[PDB]
């Protein structure tokens, strides 16, 4: 179960492999939009937070 | 124009980098690879223009 929108949680990830493989989690997505970063190129990029 | 000027477009992502002074008139959709895409699709089969 997820949290409400007024008390949304935030989980910090800083010491894990950023493997963007969201395809196996309900692949027929209703709204999959990307802002500033390409969809397929995100898997080969490093960030801070 | 106010919410117009659709005649000028661009390509945000392509299957391969264009050669120097290379021109591409076609605007086919990039294949996803992990999922067979014929028409519209999700992750990696969006419209380039």
From Swiss-Prot, chain A:
It comes from Severe acute respiratory syndrome coronavirus 2. Changing residue 23 to I: In strain: Omicron/XBB.1.5, Omicron/EG.5.1. This is Spike protein S1. It comes from the Viruses. Attaches the virion to the cell membrane by interacting with host receptor, initiating the infection. The major receptor is host ACE2. When S2/S2' has been cleaved, binding to the receptor triggers direct fusion at the cell membrane. When S2/S2' has not been cleaved, binding to the receptor results in internalization of the virus by endocytosis using host TFRC and GRM2 and leading to fusion of the virion membrane with the host endosomal membrane. Alternatively, may use NRP1/NRP2 and integrin as entry receptors. Binds to host ACE2. RBD also interacts with the N-linked glycan on 'Asn-90' of ACE2. Cleavage of S generates a polybasic C-terminal sequence on S1 that binds to host Neuropilin-1 (NRP1) and Neuropilin-2 (NRP2) receptors. Interacts with host integrin alpha-5/beta-1 (ITGA5:ITGB1) and with ACE2 in complex with integrin alpha-5/beta-1 (ITGA5:ITGB1). May interact via cytoplasmic c-terminus with M protein. May interact (via N-terminus) with host bilirubin and biliverdin, thereby preventing antibody binding to the SARS-CoV-2 spike NTD via an allosteric mechanism. The gene is S.
Swiss-Prot record, chain B:
Changing residue 32 to V: Increased resistance to neutralizing antibodies. Changing residue 43 to V: In strain: Omicron/BA.4, Omicron/BA.5, Omicron/BQ.1.1. Residues 1-49 are annotated as: Receptor-binding motif. Residues 5-13 are annotated as: Immunodominant HLA epitope recognized by the CD8+. Changing residue 10 to F: Decreased HLA binding to NF9 epitope. Increased binding affinity to human ACE2. Residues 12-47 are annotated as: Disordered. Changing residue 9 to R: In strain: Delta/B.1.617.2, Epsilon/B.1.427/B.1.429, Kappa/B.1.617.1, Lambda/C.37, 19B/501Y, Omicron/BA.4, Omicron/BA.5, Omicron/BQ.1.1; Contributes to cellular immunity evasion and increases infectivity. Changing residue 13 to L: In strain: Omicron/EG.5.1. Binds to host ACE2. RBD also interacts with the N-linked glycan on 'Asn-90' of ACE2. Cleavage of S generates a polybasic C-terminal sequence on S1 that binds to host Neuropilin-1 (NRP1) and Neuropilin-2 (NRP2) receptors. Interacts with host integrin alpha-5/beta-1 (ITGA5:ITGB1) and with ACE2 in complex with integrin alpha-5/beta-1 (ITGA5:ITGB1). May interact via cytoplasmic c-terminus with M protein. May interact (via N-terminus) with host bilirubin and biliverdin, thereby preventing antibody binding to the SARS-CoV-2 spike NTD via an allosteric mechanism. Attaches the virion to the cell membrane by interacting with host receptor, initiating the infection. The major receptor is host ACE2. When S2/S2' has been cleaved, binding to the receptor triggers direct fusion at the cell membrane. When S2/S2' has not been cleaved, binding to the receptor results in internalization of the virus by endocytosis using host TFRC and GRM2 and leading to fusion of the virion membrane with the host endosomal membrane. Alternatively, may use NRP1/NRP2 and integrin as entry receptors. This is Spike protein S1.
């Amino acid at each position: 179960r997820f949290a409400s929108v007024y008390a949304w949680n935030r989980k910090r990830i800083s010491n894990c492999v950023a493997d963007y493989s969201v395809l196996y989690n309900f692949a027929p997505f209703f709204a999959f939009k990307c802002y500033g970063v390409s969809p397929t190129k995100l898997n080969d990029l490093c960030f801070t937070n | 124009k106010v919410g117009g000027n659709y005649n000028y477009l661009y390509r945000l992502f392509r299957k391969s980098n264009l050669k120097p002074f290379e021109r591409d008139i076609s605007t086919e959709i990039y294949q996803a690879g992990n999922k067979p895409c014929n028409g519209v699709a999700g992750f990696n089969c969006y419209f380039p223009l």
